[PDB]
Amino acid sequence: LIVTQTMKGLDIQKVAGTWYSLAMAASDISLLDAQSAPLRVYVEELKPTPEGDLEILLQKWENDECAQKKIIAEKTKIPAVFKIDALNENKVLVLDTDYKKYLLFCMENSAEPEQSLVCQCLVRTPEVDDEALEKFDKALKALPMHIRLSFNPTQLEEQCHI
Ligand SMILES: CCCCCCCCCCCC
């Protein structure tokens, strides 16, 4: 109940493949602040299952290394919303995608909204896609975002973005 965009007609099987987290933004600086921040996740691959869940492979700096992660987000009745499993009732919404060049997703908590929201602009290749960043930046003005990170091709090709 804070992300007012959601993609109609999502073919979740088609968003499979490798992805780059070109940009990311959050509702609070603490979430994207340092390399070991909570929602500073770098996405590598998206893996839908035949039943319809979504397996995410990502990287995240943690105990001071760059560690791979495996996260699986489960199907709901709304084709563009998935539930990741943790202590908290946390939700993934696919905002938009042409399957071939970009995907915009946000990641909010059930809990308290301005305390939750993180969004990313995924692109298929290590290239700065301006119109991808246009749609990401325009889906995001209707949100209360306070920190915006953005990465360049050289960082897009290195573990944890340098
Ligand atoms: C540590 C919990 C955050 C991981 C969430 C990753 C969400 C990426 C899914 C992209 C949706 C198509």
* Ordered domains of the chain (ranges, CATH): 1-162 (2.40.128.20)
Report the atom number in ligand 1 closest to the C-alpha of 43. Answer: 8
- Long-range CB pairs of 35-43 (<8 Å, 24+ gap) are 35/61, 35/160, 36/60, 36/61, 36/62, 36/64, 39/107, 39/118, 40/149, 41/69, 41/120, 42/160, 42/161, 43/19, 43/120, 43/122
Distance of CA 151 to the CA centre of its chain: 14
Q: Where in 20-132 does DSSP place strands (E)?
A: 20-26, 42-48, 54-61, 66-75, 81-84, 90-97, 102-108, 118-123
In degrees and rounded to multiples of 5, residue 58 shows phi and psi of -145, 170
**Entry resolution in angstroms?**
2.9
Closest CA to 58 of 40, 70, 49: 70
How many other C-beta atoms lie within 10 A of the C-beta of residue 100?
8
Give DSSP secondary structure letters for 125-160: SSS--HHHHHHHHHHHTTS---EEEE--HHHHTSTT
- What residues are paired with 48 via a beta bridge? 54
On the 0-12 / 13-18 / 19+ scale of CB atoms within 10 A, 161 is buried
What is the number of the ligand 1 atom nearest to the C-alpha of 82? 11
CB 113 within 8 A of CB 3: no
Distant-in-sequence, close-in-space partners of 139: CB < 8 Å, separation ≥ 6? 5, 95, 96, 104, 119
Place of tokens 């944890």: 160
8-state DSSP, 31: G
Contact 14, 124 (CB under 8 A): no
Which of 29, 21, 2 is CA-nearest to residue 120? 21
CA distance 137 to 121: 9
Read off the tokens for 52: 């319809």
Solved using: X-ray
Containing 18, the helix (H) or strand (E) segment is strand 17-18
C-beta 46 within 6 A of ligand 1: yes
- CA–centroid distance, 92 to ligand 1, in Å, is 7
Does the beta carbon of 71 lie inside 6 Å of ligand 1? yes
Residue 104 CA to ligand 1 center (angstroms) comes to 11
